[model samples]
Target: MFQQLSARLQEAIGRLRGRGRITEEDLKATLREIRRALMDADVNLEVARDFVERVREEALGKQVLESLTPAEVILATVYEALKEALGGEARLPVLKDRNLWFLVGLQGSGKTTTAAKLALYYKGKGRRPLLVAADTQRPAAREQLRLLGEKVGVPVLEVMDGESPESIRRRVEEKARLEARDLILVDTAGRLQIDEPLMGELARLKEVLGPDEVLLVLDAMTGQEALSVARAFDEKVGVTGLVLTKLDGDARGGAALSARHVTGKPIYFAGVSEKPEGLEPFYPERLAGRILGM
Candidate 1:
């Protein structure tokens, strides 16, 4: 949906498409609009600047010439630059061994939606997944996941209030053992930001439960701020991977590259649509094309 960039970007490099000879000055002028296009896309000012510099380095490093369709090749180089800006699709964490995956993020970051989507994804792959609503602090949080679990036909394990987060994890682990569930998806509580109480709670739960994969569920629409939040969570709780939500709305998921590089976690999954069937394993090439619309 976000394939097309603004005309400003087109005007920037539209001329280089088939130039016979590319000049250093020619690339300099082109990057000017490319930078504007990124800023227009709501990319962080710093992020956009870094991108421009890197693409410049990359273009000169490769010794791009007019012999190659400079515009096409330059756009190609910009696409690569965006890919590197977003973390290159590296290895995603393997959770099948321990079969326990936890989701952490701020409220309104779509963690609940991602949790259900993840269940459907695993179930489709033939693993029996149990959805645990560990967010009892919010009145509607657990119920929201419970309703979604029913729609997907995946069992939802809800722990009542006053139950320690430890109790919630233990109960789910016990249920997994009895039902022989291959994966246990824990949807943890969300905080406004990285707060002491929230991090402490997550830390305690992580210590008690020892999740096989602690995934940071981030909303892509938050842009560069999402990277900061991911880093904070990783620093506090030690994330095993990231699940980027709201990709359908993120015309600029290029932030994924930056987040990946900054946090050093593979993007395990992304939600492109609201449907249970919409969760997809992240691929940098696909996201790179999405960023450049080529």
Candidate 2:
């Protein structure tokens, strides 16, 4: 997914290699290249600009050391910044018995698909997963999750478009108890704060569900637009983590970076494919290395 961005970063870093001594102009040239690379990759504007300035400040303050050359040292600095941008190391969700994970996002943001992937993911971990399709707004959403649940070999609790949150909660817990399901992964309706009715419904469902994880599922293809969505959702719903879906695409690098950096939420997983088993735990260090053209 990061092939192009990684190569661009490497191309920029290449300018610093084989240099006996570093100067402001050298750093300027490299930073300029990196800044453009980031912009071209669709990184958030402030993030790209701030990143270059941060690197410049750090590189300028450095005293030459014999062990590591200028290029290697600058690479390390860039790596550190990128790591921070990727949320500073991985922090996967700490799951326990009877986990209730609420998945939320805008329409077509892969919320439904992520719910299924998460079901498959937790099921692999020996969890007796129960899928809950609570997206009552989208007519096909319930059946979508239901079908995915069939493939995943898990039971899905579908919510009708007009079902009350209180009623839905009662029935889902009852089903969990009867089936011995330890995980209740609820797929909430895609709602924006502008839609009072939908947002209110989500708020009610969230209250009744009392989720252990409020994961914001996002499409990496959305680019910088995903950052505002991240911030808005976090502000309205208090997101606990992130799942960047559709990461199989090349545009994932910038979106992932901005989402993590802007929201300050730990990305627990990356939806690399559409298959039920496509979800993978997000690791910041590894992603930073990839973005740094390692």
Candidate 3:
């Protein structure tokens, strides 16, 4: 349902499967097919190029010519390369005695919805979570969090107009203490990474609260431009991890393949749907298998 990336890639792999002897031409043809596969999937130009080159080097270096199972070795080489590009392993948000996650992203990046998703996710783990409707910029933002909080059976702390960061922290601490909540999810105002005033305000709030995690929620459909957004948000806002949304759409799911390459941050989760439970922990090995058609 997600990747057209894998379907085409599978055919490319079929080119070399069970070959007794692989010539340079055969390897080149397979690489050419893989290059096209990645391109058609909308993988970042540089990332796709680098991946092909790495595969070429790794296959040649591993002496695929001498291996009893050349196709398997080449496949394993590609698998490792894919995992490297996709962050090699998943990184989970620290589940501790307490955690405060500050969610930030561009407008319509599903920041509000993800907050509730995170709440429901951890709530299932038997952790007391408090979702804060801290998006004061939007009119119904607080109401949205409140409604989701009710639906998820968690408490939401709505921020008042003109509330200073210091004031909000006090309220958060008080509410967290009173409710015995171990997890605090703050849904901040949605804005572009370049918005000076909003970015500064968010930085201030982040400074004041000292959150355990600052998650940059991204829309996977944004494609190549999403890399620049990830760079800007990471540099300006200090993203501890990423939550890539809209993977279920016709977005090619390219951004997921390129994001860790661009940002060097772990992809903590992927938004597979609009449903509350659509969130999924990112697994590079599994995704690599899909990309390799294994």
Clashes per candidate (backbone, < 3 Å): 3, 0, 0
Colliding pairs, model 1: 16-71, 86-257, 87-257
lDDT digits (tens) for residues 1-294 of candidate 3: 345766766667666666677787888888888888777777888899999999999899999777666678778888898887878877889877889999988877888888899999999988999999887677587888899889888899999887899999999999999999999999998865469788888888999999999998888888767778878887777899898888788446678878877788888988888878988888888878876667
Q: Pairing residues by index, what is the TM-score of model 2?
A: 0.93
Query: For residues 130-243, what per-residue lDDT tens digits would candidate 2 score against the true structure?
Result: 999897767687888999999999899998778888899899999999999998989887654336576667777788888999998888888877878888777776799999
TM-score rank order: 3, 2, 1
Candidate 1 vs candidate 2: which has greater TM-score? 2
Best by lDDT: 3
Q: After superposition, how far is residue 57 of candidate 2 from its true place, in Å?
A: 2.9
Candidate 2 deviation (Cα RMSD): 2.0
Predicted candidate 1 versus true structure: per-residue lDDT over 64-144, tens digit per residue: 763466777677788787767666654566755648888999988888889999889888888899998887677588999
Taken over the whole model, the C-alpha lDDT of each candidate is 0.79, 0.82, 0.83
